[PDB]
Amino acid sequence: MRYIHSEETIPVPENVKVSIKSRLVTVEGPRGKLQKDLSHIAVNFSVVKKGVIGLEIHHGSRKDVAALRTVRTIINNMIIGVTKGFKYKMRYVYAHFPINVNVEKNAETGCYEVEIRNFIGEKIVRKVVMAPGVEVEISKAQKDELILSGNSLEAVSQSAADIQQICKVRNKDIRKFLDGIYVSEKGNIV
Template sequence: MRYIFSEEQVVVPDDVSMKIRSRIVTVEGPRGKLTKDLSHIAVTFTLPEKKNKDGKQVLNVNIHHGSRKNVATLRTVKSIIDNLITGVTKGYKYKMRYVYAHFPINVNIEKTDDGRQNVEIRNFLGEKLVRYVKMLDGVNVEPSKGVKDQIEITGNSLENVSQSAADIQQICRVRNKDIRKFLDGLYVSERGNITED
């Protein structure tokens, strides 16, 4: 079955400006600028000059003659744009805790030449191997103040922040041992925004 017309609406806050050109969405806000290429998804964007009855600017995302799967992508596109707006207004923060039974994990944070940060993990399960994780663009890592064995990963792009956290967690996977017994690693303990309101 085909749906003749389907539409989702994204409310754009006053302090955020949005530009869409050939399905490449650029969102600019108080925290910075984010760009997302959605040219592979066959949807139509309309950003009317007039505001809605509440005085807010609204972005319309619609699709004509879409199948059920095509209509499902509308909600995905809406969520992606909502995440971009949240990123440039509030930012994203992930907290990760070190978990170890016997060998304490040592984590060092270094700056690389290209301005990104490198996370260096030593003494995982007592191994001599040093694990390195390079953070993605716009991602900042720092040890938590006042909390032992915790790091905070912050940034504007939800994709980059969550992928950096996942890279750290996955590099500390326990191999060739019973993972029910060996629970060591770095795990995400809390997800939130940088500016809480």
């Protein structure tokens, strides 16, 4: 079955500017500006109402209709990123060797870098380079905690996943060795 018309709607707050040109969405708000190329999905954008974006597919199959939900959630996440931001709080715990985490800003690349030392007594220094736009802060309120803040949910969550996956225990019982860095809390900055 091919459905003749299928539509989704996105409400837009007052402080958001959305510019779509050849399926390239540019969302700018108080915190910053994000861009995303959605040209790989056949979709027609329109202004159905004031502050309302309309997404429509004509003569599409069920897969083509279902793709609009992904596009809707992507644009909504961009709007939430430029309005409230995204914040991932991570906690690093240890049993015997205290894990040392250093955060600096590589200014030549314009991006933050995290150096992890003494992970279960290893002499190697693990290094994680952040995606641009993600800011790393060692939390002063709680103990042994990083905070990743940004406008791009994909960038912040991918940086968090990189920090988890660079600290993995190998050739040991994971029931006994609980060392590592884990994402404790996910939420919005504001």
